[PDB]
Copies of this chain bind each other. A is one copy, B any other.
């Protein structure tokens, strides 16, 4: 079992299911109000690694509005150490506003909120967790200077750093040079390398860019096309299982959480860990069947 620290976002996702998206100036009518669910790349990845039974600690910053209190309960049920979660009155808890149509298209707006107020001092404050970790994992729903500071601590004490550079954005060298394992998707790879992902040769070209700037291990998630990885010594393309074209089930984050849960410190099992990650991820788009969702008394008593 790996010791894993996640540094990242917690969001309250507000879902409004419509039949058809309104158009500018229009007024449509909907059946239900917004339903709130737990979200955030950081929360997703934290719950994934923790459900994979990694020793998990989550450094995240929410507001003092209490809107993610139900998420905190889920963290506790998963045995995620919550000692380092920060609450601030500076901003409301991060939120996503997602309109789903009959087809299943997600249209999403993201409010950074408390997530984007996380500072290096918030991170320094949590250094004990980082120092004793095998891996620290970050995403870009939290500010770059916070991530740099966590990766400086990690790197200085021999702790492996892993960055999921999502959502896509430009990174400074100060950060790039601190990353041991980078895990973009095709779109994120091309924004960082300048090189589009198409044939296996472009994947090699991407990997070579990352290796040249000091990143030791490169994965490019390819969606239905699976996953590519490279080190100085290895280069492999691995097939996926069940995967939706658009991620709408936290499959990407589930892949990362599980990948990291399975990775040996030595990284001698890249392909095995990537396999396990792709397994975990497929379970998220998996149908359970009608009988399976026939409710229990307790659940109905709560309606």
Given contacts A39-B290, A103-B102, A303-B241, contact A283 B295 (CB under 8 A): yes
Q: Pick the residue among B51, B103, B276 that contacts A294 (CB under 8 A).
A: B51
How many of chain A's residues have a CB under 8 angstroms from any CB in B? 47
- Please tell me if the beta carbons of A44 and B284 are within 8 angstroms of each other in the complex: no
Q: Is A26 an interface residue (CB 8 A)?
A: no
- Spot the interface stretch: A84-92, A132-140, A215-223, A248-256: A248-256
- Chain B proximity mask over A127-158: 1 for CB below 8 Å, otherwise 0: 00000000000000000000000000000000
Q: Is A170 an interface residue (CB 8 A)?
A: no
Q: Is A266 an interface residue (CB 8 A)?
A: no
- Please tell me if the beta carbons of A51 and B289 are within 8 angstroms of each other in the complex: no
Q: How far is the CA of A283 from the CA of B53 in the complex (A)?
A: 30
Q: How far is the CA of A23 from the CA of B211 in the complex (A)?
A: 51
Which A38-74 residues sit within 8 Å CB-CB of chain B? 38-39, 43-44, 47-48, 51-53, 71, 74
Contact residues in B for A296 (Cβ distance below 8 Å): 51
- Chain B proximity mask over A13-36: 1 for CB below 8 Å, otherwise 0: 101010000000000000010010
Contact residues in B for A38 (Cβ distance below 8 Å): 289-292
Q: Is A287 an interface residue (CB 8 A)?
A: yes
Q: How far is the CA of A292 from the CA of B48 in the complex (A)?
A: 10
Contact residues in B for A284 (Cβ distance below 8 Å): 290, 293-295
- Measured CB to CB, the nearest residue on chain B to A290 is B250
Chain A interface residues toward B at CB < 8 A: 13, 15, 17, 32, 35, 37-39, 43-44, 47-48, 51-53, 71, 74, 102-103, 241-242, 248-250, 253-254, 257-258, 276, 279-280, 282-284, 287, 289-297, 299-300, 303
